[PDB]
């Protein structure tokens, strides 16, 4: 939690529980990327909100809609387990052949 | 952290540290709202990524770009302390009169 910002047991439960980030290392051979989070319609496709990216050893909080996702990037996001499943299919596995 | 998803000390540091959410209760008299996160250009304006909203007692993870912000809503977001300051100015205080 952030020092000198309000604290409570209830807030901590949320921060630690339903808001705990998920993470997925994008495959090195994912070919449909090199495009912005905005262009990729991530929330529409998966339900996820991306909160951070690690790109070539650099961790970026709040990448925003104009950041690009490249193969190999490590994506951090909020959601639930079903969002995770959709993120796995969208970034790595790919429906169809 | 999420059970059966990968864990490490380094990941925990990130989750607990730079990714810890901030939160701000939107003022009840903020008059420029009732508009979607997308329309409000939140990242452009503030640098923030909204991860959750509490609206009239209901907490919503990953509200996404099509959710509306209304006066009184509780917004949760990632960023840094400067993002917090910009969020405070954008949602509540308002530059100018």
Residue numbers in the entry:
A (entry chain A), B (entry chain A): 117 to 213
Please give me the paper's original passages concerning this structure:
We purified and crystallized a construct comprising only the RCK_C domain (Leu135 to end) and solved its ligand-free and c-di-AMP bound structure to 1 and 1.2 Å resolution, respectively. The crystal of the apo state only contains one monomer in the asymmetric unit. However, a symmetry related copy is present that generates the dimeric assembly as common to RCK_C domains and as observed in our full-length structure. The scattering data show that the RCK_C domain on its own is dimeric in solution even in the absence of c-di-AMP. The apo and c-di-AMP bound crystal structure of the RCK_C domain show that c-di-AMP binding induces a subtle rotation of the RCK_C domains that results in a widening of the binding pocket. This movement pushes residues Pro179, Gly180, Pro181 and Phe182 (chain A) further out in respect to Trp159 (chain B) of the opposing chain. Thus, it seems that this interface locks wHTHinhib in an autoinhibited state in absence of c-di-AMP, restricting movement of wHTHinhib and thus impairing high affinity binding to the operator sequence.
BusR is a member of a yet structurally uncharacterized subfamily of the GntR family of transcription factors that downregulates transcription of the genes for the BusA (OpuA) glycine-betaine transporter upon c-di-AMP binding. BusR satisfies the overall domain architecture of the GntR family with its N-terminal winged helix-turn-helix motif (wHTH) and a C-terminal effector binding motif, an RCK_C domain (regulator of K+ conductance). Our structural data, supported by biochemical and biophysical data, reveal that BusR utilizes a unique domain assembly with a tetrameric coiled-coil in between the binding platforms, serving as a molecular ruler to specifically recognize a 22 bp separated bipartite binding motif. Binding of c-di-AMP to BusR induces a shift in equilibrium from an inactivated towards an activated state that allows BusR to bind the target DNA, leading to transcriptional repression.
